[PDB]
Structures are given as C-alpha cells and as structure tokens.
C-alpha cells in the first residue's frame, strides 16, 4: 500500500522485495492492492540492467 505519491519510489522499492519472498514462498496468486495507485505512480515490470 502506497497512498502518498511522495513515497512511491520508496514504498514500491520494498514492494518488489516482498514479491520475491512471495515467489519464493510459492504463492499461486499475487495482486497489487490498488489499481489507482498503480496508474498514479506508473509501475512497470522490467528486467534489471546487467550494467550493475
């Protein structure tokens, strides 16, 4: 849950870490909480750059 736009890049940073634990835990269905917050912040799923 994000709410305030000012904490988007901060909260969403921990969101990805929690997702990895869920994938490790084997959760079959995982959803983001808010459609509004997803579009407000504009989150995407991209492979991290191999630069470093």
């Amino acid at each position: 849950f994000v709410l305030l736009p000012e904490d988007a890049k901060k909260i969403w940073a921990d969101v990805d870490k929690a997702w990895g634990l869920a994938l490790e835990a084997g959760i079959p269905h995982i959803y983001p909480w808010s459609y509004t917050q997803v579009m407000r912040d504009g989150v995407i799923y991209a492979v991290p750059k191999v630069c470093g």
Binding site: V38, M39, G42, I44
Partner: protein
C-alpha cells in the same frame, strides 16, 4: 470512451458507452444542490504513462 464525470458527493452517477459515437450517463438525484458534470479533459491525468494521449489546448 475517454469522457469523465464529476458531481457532488451526495449523488451517484456513472458513465457507460453503448455505441460508436454515443454514451449514457445513468444517475440518481437526492438533493436540490445535486450538480452532475460530464467533462472532456484536454490533458490526461488518469491513464498510465504508457497510455496517455497528447495534450493540446487548441480547439480552433
């Protein structure tokens, strides 16, 4: 498909398209001060950054 609505918090209204160039706005009126506004936004502030449309305030 891109029109939006706004109204007083004491009423309920939704917008639903039903044709190529037509749409319906069912609503419920509860108070005398109810004011429903169907508006077209020049700039996009609801869609995703990859789904926004170009902004142009010139309607001449």
């Amino acid at each position: 498909e891109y029109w939006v609505v706004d109204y007083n918090a004491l009423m309920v209204a939704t917008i639903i398209p039903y044709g190529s160039k037509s749409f319906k706005v069912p609503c419920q009126w509860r108070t005398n001060k109810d004011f429903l506004g169907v508006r077209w936004m020049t700039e996009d502030t609801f869609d995703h950054h990859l789904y926004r449309y170009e902004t142009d305030p010139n309607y001449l």
